[PDB]
């Protein structure tokens, strides 16, 4: 979470383990992300560290630019593609699963965003909400 | 009480204990003094200063001023009529009650009895006494003299001594920056009251020899007359 990361986190569904490739929505030139780790987890015997929306994750890049590929960096989840629950009653999900990059203090690296983003993520984090064109 | 005793503090100091050798030494030495000198004076001196005694001794070298422990001085003088170096000494061994102290002269009586009335110094309260002044300490910065001299030239008191002022001296002493301050004025004492030990100590801490010092005497003996004399002069 760290400096900048605002608020608390509600319990949302933990769809994405480590090692699920997802797309990237910013205008850095990075195409896709590959998670290697999640931050702020617990631990349970032979659990995988599970990722969700609204989470700041340690993750590498596979396709993209040569400068940013294949090195671990902080990333926010924005799109799940597995069904989660709102507290105002509805269940929902996106077409495909997606996350963006940013620094450890939560500040955005790119200058744009594609596609819709998570409401809880944009509420929890300022800067994706600053760079967000689309939410829900 | 073989165990669970106190441990008395051991050190490596230089001075060692005297014992009976010095006791009997001074005993025989005053007994040597007795036949040698002629005029004998018993000196009650309760408050005493080392430089005052040395001042008196270097004033009068033809005299000899001796001090030592009381009961051995009574011994060497002789306490009974039955045991005494010379006669008519037991009766004046009775009276010598206070801190004594003794002199062996051959000079006149008149010169000394006027000397010790002329001889006056300045000393401290030494309580169970009066001190001929009162002291209010003002509700400001506190100083080494305690309001005696002007406030420009007195030096404020050191920040080391203040917890002693809070503990021993019973006084509220509150610490602003590096000098020391008080919030209410503090009167320490009045005239015409017997000074207490904390009162004596605070005037000591201010460093005030406000009390007069003069020695009294009670009596006199002469060897050649072999007669006792009683004189209360202060």
């Amino acid at each position: 979470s760290g400096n900048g990361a605002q608020g608390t986190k509600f319990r949302i569904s933990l769809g994405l383990p480590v090692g699920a490739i997802m797309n990237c929505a910013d205008n850095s030139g990075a195409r896709n992300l590959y998670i290697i780790a999640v931050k702020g987890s617990g631990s349970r015997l032979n659990r995988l560290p599970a990722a969700s929306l609204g989470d700041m994750v340690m993750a590498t890049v596979k396709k993209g630019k040569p400068e940013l590929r294949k090195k671990v960096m902080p990333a926010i989840v924005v799109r799940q593609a597995k069904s989660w629950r709102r507290r105002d009653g509805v269940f929902l999900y996106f077409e495909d699963n997606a996350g963006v990059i940013a620094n450890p203090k939560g500040e955005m690296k790119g200058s744009a965003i594609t596609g819709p983003v998570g409401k809880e993520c944009a509420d929890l984090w300022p800067r994706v909400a600053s760079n967000s064109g689309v939410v829900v | 009480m073989p165990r669970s005793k106190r441990s008395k503090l051991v050190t490596l100091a230089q001075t060692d204990k005297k014992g009976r050798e010095n006791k009997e030494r001074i005993f025989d030495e005053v007994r040597e003094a007795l036949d040698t000198y002629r005029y004998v004076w018993v000196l009650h001196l309760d408050d005493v200063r080392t430089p005052v005694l040395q001042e008196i001794r270097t004033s009068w070298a033809g005299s000899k001023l001796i001090m030592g422990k009381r009961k051995v001085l009574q011994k060497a003088l002789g306490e009974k009529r039955e045991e005494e170096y010379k006669e008519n000494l037991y009766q004046l061994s009775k009276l010598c009650s206070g801190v004594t102290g003794l002199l062996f002269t051959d000079e006149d009586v008149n010169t000394v009895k006027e000397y010790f009335k002329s001889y006056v110094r300045s000393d401290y309260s030494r309580p169970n006494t009066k001190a001929p002044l009162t002291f209010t300490i003002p509700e400001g910065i506190v100083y080494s003299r305690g309001g005696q001299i002007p406030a420009e030239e007195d030096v404020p008191m050191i920040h080391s001594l203040e917890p002693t002022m809070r503990n021993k001296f019973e006084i509220p002493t509150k610490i602003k920056a590096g000098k020391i301050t008080i919030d209410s004025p503090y009167l320490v004492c009045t005239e015409g009251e017997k000074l207490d030990v904390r009162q004596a100590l605070i005037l000591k801490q201010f460093g005030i020899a406000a009390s007069e010092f003069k020695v009294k005497v009670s009596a006199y003996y002469d060897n050649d007359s072999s007669t006792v004399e009683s004189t209360n002069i202060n």
Binding site: - | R166, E170, P172, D183
Partner: protein, 191 residues
């Protein structure tokens, strides 16, 4: 060395009266009364007459007789605590944050209430024991006075009170602030 008989003297003054059944004491004087059980201590008491009472032990071990001297001094402390009464004086010093100190009564509880400690919001209450009274200092800044007959109650209450402000995890040489005792006197002044 198994001392056979040990003994001490305690001095009753003219004003005060004392009633001792078996190992119970009551001590009554002008300021009031006190009581104390001493059944755990296994000694003997005796009057001779009315200004002096004798405590004693027969067949004493070291522990037994050290207890004898102790019990004398305890009873003397009670005697002083009636005829004089005891009086303990504290001050509550701060660098940045003034204490708000108060007295309250919750169903007759006589709690002592401190706030603004080190910029806290916390209320801390301390009880008052029976038999002891408070006064905040009139015409003296940042000072409180306690007075009572039970010396043990007084000291326990104030020792509690400075034990409350045991400021924690912080360098004592810097945080000189706290509430502490100025001195332990009697009430009287004169005597």
């Amino acid at each position: 060395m198994k001392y056979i008989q040990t003994e001490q003297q305690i001095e009753v003054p003219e004003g005060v009266t004392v009633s001792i059944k078996s190992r119970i004491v009551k001590v009554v004087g002008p300021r009031g009364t006190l009581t104390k059980n001493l059944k755990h201590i296994d000694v003997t008491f005796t009057k001779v007459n009315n200004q002096l009472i004798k405590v004693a032990v027969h067949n004493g071990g070291r522990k037994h007789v050290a207890a004898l001297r102790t019990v004398k001094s305890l009873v003397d402390n009670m005697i002083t605590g009636v005829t004089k009464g005891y009086k303990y004086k504290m001050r509550y010093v701060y660098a940045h944050f003034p204490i708000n100190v108060n007295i309250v009564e919750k169903d007759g509880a006589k709690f002592i209430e401190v706030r603004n400690f080190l910029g806290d919001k916390k209320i801390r209450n301390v009880p008052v024991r029976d038999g002891v009274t408070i006064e905040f200092s009139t015409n003296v800044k940042d000072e409180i006075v306690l007075s009572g007959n039970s010396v043990e109650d007084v000291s326990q209450n104030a020792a509690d009170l400075q034990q409350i402000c045991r400021v924690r995890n912080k360098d004592i040489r810097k945080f000189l602030d706290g509430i502490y005792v100025s001195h332990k006197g009697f009430i009287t002044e004169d005597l």
